[PDB]
Amino acid sequence: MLEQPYLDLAKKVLDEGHFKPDRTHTGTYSIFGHQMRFDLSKGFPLLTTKKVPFGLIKSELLWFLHGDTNIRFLLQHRNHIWDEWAFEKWVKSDEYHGPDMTDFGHRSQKDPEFAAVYHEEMAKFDDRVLHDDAFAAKYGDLGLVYGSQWRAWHTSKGDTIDQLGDVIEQIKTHPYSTRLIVSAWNPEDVPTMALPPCHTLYQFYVNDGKLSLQLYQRSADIFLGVPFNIASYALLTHLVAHECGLEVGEFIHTFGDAHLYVNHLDQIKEQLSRTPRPAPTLQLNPDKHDIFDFDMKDIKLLNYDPYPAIKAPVAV
């Protein structure tokens, strides 16, 4: 089945994975250097052996495509994937007044009394970002995230580069280019970042009228992260092919450190006992072509029939 490479990567990390310690202070079994490909003509790689929220991957990628860096658009779509990063800034700000939220992460995962007050301040944080325009502009804007790196890379002469917009024009004018690369790794920002991009860079490739994309991921959470990472980039490969009047090829996912947290063992073992169903189909709006002006409604996933979602603890 189409998602077999993922299941295979999970097995490999189980057998050959070396216990390696991590930042979150949770253990991990790890492997360095791996590569899997998905032929996008055989279907969309959204895992069927576990239910993955496509709306989350869809709204987030659009947020990226718009070059947007403000949580506000995500929250409007009930997408809380980035709330944590924005909320941190609020909390550590001189104008923040409320309970102590020091290390609210692996403190909420412990104490239920704290976890409760944590979901309060955040609920409030999300409400202000959503309705207070100056608030959103100050704590709702993350600044250096994918939308900015892809569409507004800052130059030393104070200008901004639309990396992605430029490369798309290159695919139109020089399909056979081996320089169709978009980087998200900036040496001057990386040392001051809380999270240097996990998805370092990607390269497009065209041959026989088919567009392919290879992603280099420096670190990956085999269980919780990877199912999403695959769908985002396979989705991106689809949007660009659509804009460039091309056909889809393969999505090649290359890994640096691929790991499985120690508290995802029973869950990963359970998913593995499941039998892949046929992959869904992605359908895009044929009338609209400027992918930068695409909305939720323009992308539709047909025939997704997954097994129940598998709950697991997050590492912090």
Among 16, 133, 166, 295, binds a copy of itself (CB under 8 A): 166
Binders of a copy of itself: how many residues, by CB under 8 A? 46
SS (H, E, C) 211-267: EEEEEEEEEEECCCCHHHHHHHHHHHHHHHHHHCCCEEEEEEEEEEEEEEEHHHHHH
Least CB distance from residue 222 to ligand U5P, whole Å?
Answer: 8
The 10 Å CB-count burial string (b at 16+, else e) for 133-169 is eebbeebbbbebbbbbbbbbbeeeeeeeeebbeebbe
Q: Which stretch binds a copy of itself (CB under 8 A): 109-117, 178-186, 240-248, 264-272?
A: 178-186
With binding defined as CB under 8 A, does residue 25 bind a copy of itself?
no
Minimum distance from CB of 156 to a copy of itself (Å)? Answer: 4
Q: Is the dihedral of CA 72, 74, 75, 81 positive or negative?
A: negative
Question: What span, in angstroms and rounded, lies between the C-alpha atoms of 9 and 223?
Answer: 10
Active-site entry in 7, 117, 152, 198: 198
Choose, by CB under 5 A, the member of 26, 170, 177, 183 that binds K ion. 183
Query: Among residue numbers 237 through 296, which ones bind a copy of itself (CB under 8 A)?
Result: 250, 252, 254, 256-257
Residue 301 phi/psi, 5° resolution? -95, 110
161 binds K ion (CB under 5 A): no
Whether residue 244 lies in the annotated active site: no
Cα–Cα distance, 316 to 105 (Å, whole number): 6
- Site residues (vs ligand U5P, CB under 6 A): 23, 178-179, 195, 198, 219-221, 225-226, 228-229
* Helices then strands, each counted (H, E), the chain: 11, 10
Q: Could you list the active site residues?
A: 198
Residues at the interface with a copy of itself (CB under 8 A): 18, 20-22, 30, 32-35, 37, 153-158, 161, 163, 166, 176, 178-179, 181, 183, 185, 187-188, 190-191, 196, 200-201, 203, 205, 207-208, 212, 214, 216, 218-219, 250, 252, 254, 256-257
